[PDB]
Amino acid sequence: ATPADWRSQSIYFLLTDRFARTDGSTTATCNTADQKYCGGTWQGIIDKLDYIQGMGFTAIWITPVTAQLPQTTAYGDAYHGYWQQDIYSLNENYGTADDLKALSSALHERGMYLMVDVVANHMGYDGAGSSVDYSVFKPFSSQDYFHPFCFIQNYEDQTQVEDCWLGDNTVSLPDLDTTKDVVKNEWYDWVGSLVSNYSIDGLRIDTVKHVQKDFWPGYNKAAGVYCIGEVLDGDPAYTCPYQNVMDGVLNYPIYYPLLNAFKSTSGSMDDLYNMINTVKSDCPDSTLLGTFVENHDNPRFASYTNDIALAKNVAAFIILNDGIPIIYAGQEQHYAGGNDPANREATWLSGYPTDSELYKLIASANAIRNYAISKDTGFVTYKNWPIYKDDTTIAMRKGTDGSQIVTILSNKGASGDSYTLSLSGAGYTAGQQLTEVIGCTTVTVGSDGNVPVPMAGGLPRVLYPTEKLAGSKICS
Ligand SMILES: OC[C@H]1O[C@H](O[C@H]2[C@H](O)[C@@H](O)[C@@H](O)O[C@@H]2CO)[C@H](O)[C@@H](O)[C@@H]1O
Ligand SMILES: OC[C@H]1O[C@H](O[C@H]2[C@H](O)[C@@H](O)[C@@H](O)O[C@@H]2CO)[C@H](O)[C@@H](O)[C@@H]1O
Ligand SMILES: OC[C@H]1O[C@H](O[C@H]2[C@H](O)[C@@H](O)[C@H](O)O[C@@H]2CO)[C@H](O)[C@@H](O)[C@@H]1O
Ligand SMILES: OC[C@H]1O[C@H](O[C@H]2[C@H](O)[C@@H](O)[C@H](O)O[C@@H]2CO)[C@H](O)[C@@H](O)[C@@H]1O
Numbered sequence: 001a002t003p004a005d006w007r008s009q010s011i012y013f014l015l016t017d018r019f020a021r022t023d024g025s026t027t028a029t030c031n032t033a034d035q036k037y038c039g040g041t042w043q044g045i046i047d048k049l050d051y052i053q054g055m056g057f058t059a060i061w062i063t064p065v066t067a068q069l070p071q072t073t074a075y076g077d078a079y080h081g082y083w084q085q086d087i088y089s090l091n092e093n094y095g096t097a098d099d100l101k102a103l104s105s106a107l108h109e110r111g112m113y114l115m116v117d118v119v120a121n122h123m124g125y126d127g128a129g130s131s132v133d134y135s136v137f138k139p140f141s142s143q144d145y146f147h148p149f150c151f152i153q154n155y156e157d158q159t160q161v162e163d164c165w166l167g168d169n170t171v172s173l174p175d176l177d178t179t180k181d182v183v184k185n186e187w188y189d190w191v192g193s194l195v196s197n198y199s200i201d202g203l204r205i206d207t208v209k210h211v212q213k214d215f216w217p218g219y220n221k222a223a224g225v226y227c228i229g230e231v232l233d234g235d236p237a238y239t240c241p242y243q244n245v246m247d248g249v250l251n252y253p254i255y256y257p258l259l260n261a262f263k264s265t266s267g268s269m270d271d272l273y274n275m276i277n278t279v280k281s282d283c284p285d286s287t288l289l290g291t292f293v294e295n296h297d298n299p300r301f302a303s304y305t306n307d308i309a310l311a312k313n314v315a316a317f318i319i320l321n322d323g324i325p326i327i328y329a330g331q332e333q334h335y336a337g338g339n340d341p342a343n344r345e346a347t348w349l350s351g352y353p354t355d356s357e358l359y360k361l362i363a364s365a366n367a368i369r370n371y372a373i374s375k376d377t378g379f380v381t382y383k384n385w386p387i388y389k390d391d392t393t394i395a396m397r398k399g400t401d402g403s404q405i406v407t408i409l410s411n412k413g414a415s416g417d418s419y420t421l422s423l424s425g426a427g428y429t430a431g432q433q434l435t436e437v438i439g440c441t442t443v444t445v446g447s448d449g450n451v452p453v454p455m456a457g458g459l460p461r462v463l464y465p466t467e468k469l470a471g472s473k474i475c476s
């Protein structure tokens, strides 16, 4: 599916090993500190697609599928998919080629997309960089395919970031020489075949800053689908340029100030407001980036604060920002694990309740986004515009005039006082009736064109014209 196709999507990102087991248990042990396969599979995900679809998501992103190093290393098993050795086999822990194909079809049958995480940068090996037997790698079964062994020390030297190896002498990640034609040719061949074999709709590409930029166009082309790259850097001057070689990137620029704005009641609304504007202007296309505040490489949001209102506002932002919302499995159950491995908790241990507060909030937020898109072909290309901020508040506007979603977010938290925000710049017509679609309440624009927004318990407010809601199942 194309970049344009992907603009309208909303992604639930999950670790295949940690989302759903084949037997469907909600009690099977998964001690994250053990760093071992806990037994999630592709069949499991299939069985739990209603859970996922019930929150309004239209796609999933799953961790890599290629066959991994077999060992339990000092850092555990390759349960996460990022330590591959045979790219032409599948990781048997998750199922068979038939199961992965079944997952693709089940998603397609519900009108959903499959995104698959892929690594081009490295293989993985249990042991020191010097001890590597390159014959275990298929097809890269010689040292000739790799950069000389050295570790990345200096992250201000981009050449060294690209040419040296990630990992350490405990688990080394032999670095492919992606400057060689034979290496380019093999990966390009490989990614096209992967996509066609498994009917994959889009790719999330791991470790993109660790491969020289000229590698990526051929790879994005060979894939023939939207690719969104992980470029692990908050500076949009570093990260956004990668959009000149790949369709999109993960929104790490927005990540840091977004987290900071909502992780406590003294978070900076200003830094978030400014970065929205920076990315809107400076990045090639903010609407093909992936918005997130939680993943498997950083402490989860609730690790910073268990305030449910703060969690609700940050989730609402992720869904309503430019680009593709990305929610990481367990965020919706208010999971609070810290750095890897603590943030790879098993989703099944929650019992998958569909009435949890976050599940409901996410459902209502995706519900309005999905609906709005169905009525407004300009919604996804309209660049989210921040219209208001104060010390504890940010407001933003998205959608064609007359059909815009106006979102008001707060970091006052659950103890927040009640009061009325007089909101200017929302652009609704005087006396228009709006529905606040999270709490299903109605608001009437002033005769001065300001919107009197009732604020309470630090709760997020999401406004849309009530007339435009006619026929929908929203706020019935
Ligand atoms: O190899 C050490 C590190 O590997 C993996 O980290 C992934 C990371 O989580 C991905 O988003 C991306 O950065 O690529 C990395 C390696 O390709 C594991 O997930 C992690 O457990 C481990 O520490
Ligand atoms: O009205 C269409 C236009 O509106 C928005 O542009 C905003 C812009 O984001 C602000 O920075 C400021 O300049 O006001 C503009 C509206 O006058 C959308 O961002 C844009 O995509 C849309 O086409
Ligand atoms: O193997 C651990 C991670 O190493 C790198 O992460 C770097 C990151 O690029 C850099 O900006 C930060 O200053 O240091 C960390 C750790 O050295 C990889 O980019 C990550 O993918 C790995 O997870
Ligand atoms: O950790 C905060 C991030 O700071 C840097 O990115 C800065 C960048 O210098 C600038 O564009 C803007 O004013 O702030 C951003 C984000 O705060 C690093 O490059 C990121 O990796 C840091 O994490």
Ligand SMILES: *[C@@H]1O[C@H](CO)[C@@H](O)[C@H](O)[C@H]1NC(C)=O
Pocket (backbone or CB within 6 Å): 087, 088, 190, 191, 193, 194, 197
């Ligand atoms: C896809 O299937 C074909 C034929 O079954 C096979 O030759 C190829 O290696 C497969 N590609 C991948 C990436 O699995």
Ligand SMILES: [Ca+2]
Pocket (backbone or CB within 6 Å): 121, 161, 162, 163, 164, 175, 176, 210, 211, 212
């Ligand atoms: Ca590299």
